[PDB]
């Protein structure tokens, strides 16, 4: 269908209730266009607080979950917890978890299927490493990632794909609209070819490299990028700028 | 002087506002010995609500946290954040994190120092597996597990040691009181041998095995047993029975 601009605010391990509410206040208060779908992903202690403070206009996403509703999982929260609280999205397969917490493609795939079954929308992340990029293996990886995911979705309608060149954000660089456009174009083409063009055309593929207030227009501008997974910049008023990018 | 009876209740990935609220309710209104020290480990998503509703006498513990104040750690929580919702404890190195999630000896240790360094009370977890118990490598394992914590502790006053007889979890095995005692007594010898008679003396060793209204009194009577880290029974009112065990 005629795919809606999506913008995700990934707060990571940042903020406290004071600082954050300030954020939210500023948000709640800002002028943003529909055209753009917005969602904030808060640290879990903050989730409820945030759903509470955030306007219905704005969706709330948990930055991770597990694939079982209950149990002997010390330290984990469940899709049902998430839901309980009123969040409706879970960010999954994030680079930091893939890489610092060693989450597997299998493990991620199961979180996707569980999250879906439980009725929460998902923004799933793929991306290659500098060395992956440099070996000339980007495609293979990003595709491996993506199928792992795909093999687990039943319903692409509560699904967003976030392409994150890991390879890039903390090492300087680019993630030039052009190198970004390219992966976006092949993914979509992948999906097309391994799923359906129906799916291919309904799914929002958001750009997740280092987006900014300066940046965004240029990226947004591109043909196959449907939005962004925003990090650092999601913590400042600049996000409004990003939200209202395509414009 | 004497060592204060500790009862930590670990909710794991269990509960909703409605049911948790219910229990907060039963807990709040019971009469618990002032002699005992109680803390509840709620899922991250429910720490604030927990904090908000638990009676002030009752302590609140996060079930995990990361080595840093802030950062690019999607899906993590910092002690700082704990401290913000007003929680005072963190449970670190729990056999699920250890074996379901791969947390290592060194990670756990890094965690401990950070947690202490920021003001929380740390409930560190150590325990051997059957394969280990079996091979007779028990001391070996828990002593290297302890060693790693120890090298990151400077003030043992905000630390509680929790032994978990993993070899007795879903193994089809049943640990005895005597087994508990033995290990506990061995943990305490290690401490006066490697740290100080004082630390040994002052430090609580709580049992992390299975506890109920039913095994609870024998256990508490054990001499090196200074409380417990309660799983299952923490979601129920028998939890009040377990709290008011030792006189």
| Residue ranges covered by each domain of chain A | 1-247
d(CA B245, CA B247): 6
A96·B72 Cβ contact <8 A: yes
Residue tagged 């291919």 (tokens):
A200
Q: Encode burial over B202-226: b for 16+ CB neighbours within 10 A, e otherwise.
A: ebbbbbbbbbbeebbeebbebebbb
A16·B80 Cβ contact <8 A: yes
Distance from CA of A196 to the nearest CA of B (A): 31
Q: Say if B41 is an interface residue toward chain A (CB within 8 Å).
A: yes
Give the three-state DSSP class for A6. Answer: strand
d(CA A234, CA A9): 5
| Phi-psi map region of B15: left, alpha, beta (phi>0 left; psi -120 to 50 alpha) | left
Please give the structure tokens belonging to residue A97: 């978890």
Find out whether A207 and A219 touch, Cβ atoms under 8 Å: yes
Element (H, E) at B59: strand B59-62
Catalytic residue among B103, B114, B164, B184: B164
List beta partners, residue B159: B122
B62·A76 Cβ contact <8 A: no
Name chain B contacts of A100, Cβ cutoff 8 Å: 73
For chains A and B, what is the number of CB pairs under 8 angstroms?
126
d(CA B181, CA B164): 12
User: For chain A, how long is the longest CA-to-CA vector?
Assistant: 48
CA-nearest residue to A72 within chain B is B12
A45·B72 Cβ contact <8 A: no
Whats the size of chain B, residue-wise?
247
Residues 107-146 of A with CB under 8 A from B: none
Distance from CA of A85 to the nearest CA of B (A): 8
* Third-level CATH fold of B1-247: TIM Barrel (3.20.20)
Q: ∠ CA B159-B78-B162 to the nearest 5 degrees?
A: 25
Contacts for B84 with CB less than 8 Å, ≥ 6 apart: A16, A17, A45
Please enumerate, by residue number, every residue of A annotated as part of a binding site for substrate.
Answer: 10, 12
Q: Nearest CB to B66: which of A13, A76, A170?
A: A13
Experimental method: X-ray
B13·A43 Cβ contact <8 A: no
Find out whether A74 and B8 touch, Cβ atoms under 8 Å: no
Q: Say if B63 is an interface residue toward chain A (CB within 8 Å).
A: yes
Told to judge if B76 belongs to the known catalytic residues of this protein, a careful annotator would answer no
d(CA B114, CA A183): 40
Helix pair angle (B138-150, B177-190), 10° resolution = 50
| Phi-psi map region of A71: left, alpha, beta (phi>0 left; psi -120 to 50 alpha) | left
The number of CA neighbours under 13 Å toward the Cβ of B128 is: 21
């Amino acid at each position: 269908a005629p795919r809606k601009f999506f913008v995700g605010g990934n707060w990571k391990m940042n903020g406290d209730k004071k600082s954050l509410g300030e954020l939210i206040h500023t948000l709640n208060g800002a002028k943003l266009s529909a055209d753009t779908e917005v969602v904030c992903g808060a640290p879990s202690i903050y989730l409820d607080f945030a759903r509470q403070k955030l306007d219905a206009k704005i969706g709330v996403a948990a930055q991770n979950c597990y694939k079982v509703p209950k149990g002997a999982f010390t330290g984990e929260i469940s899709p049902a917890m998430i839901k309980d609280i009123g969040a409706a999205w879970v960010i999954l397969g994030h680079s930091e978890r893939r890489h610092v917490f060693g989450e597997s493609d299998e493990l991620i795939g199961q979180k996707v299927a569980h999250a879906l079954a439980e009725g929460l929308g998902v923004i799933a992340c793929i991306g290659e490493k500098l060395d992956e990029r440099e070996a000339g293996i980007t495609e293979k990886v990003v595709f491996e990632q993506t199928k792992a995911i795909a093999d687990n979705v039943k319903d692409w309608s509560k699904v967003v794909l976030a392409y994150e060149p890991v390879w890039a954000i903390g090492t300087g660089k680019t993630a030039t609209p052009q190198q970004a456009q390219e992966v976006h174009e092949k993914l979509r083409g992948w999906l097309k070819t391994h799923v359906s063009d129906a799916v291919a055309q309904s799914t929002r593929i958001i750009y997740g490299g280092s987006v900014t207030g300066g940046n965004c227009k240029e990226l947004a501008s591109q043909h196959d990028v449907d939005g962004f997974l925003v990090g650092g910049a999601s913590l400042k008023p600049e996000f409004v700028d990003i939200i209202n990018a395509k414009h």
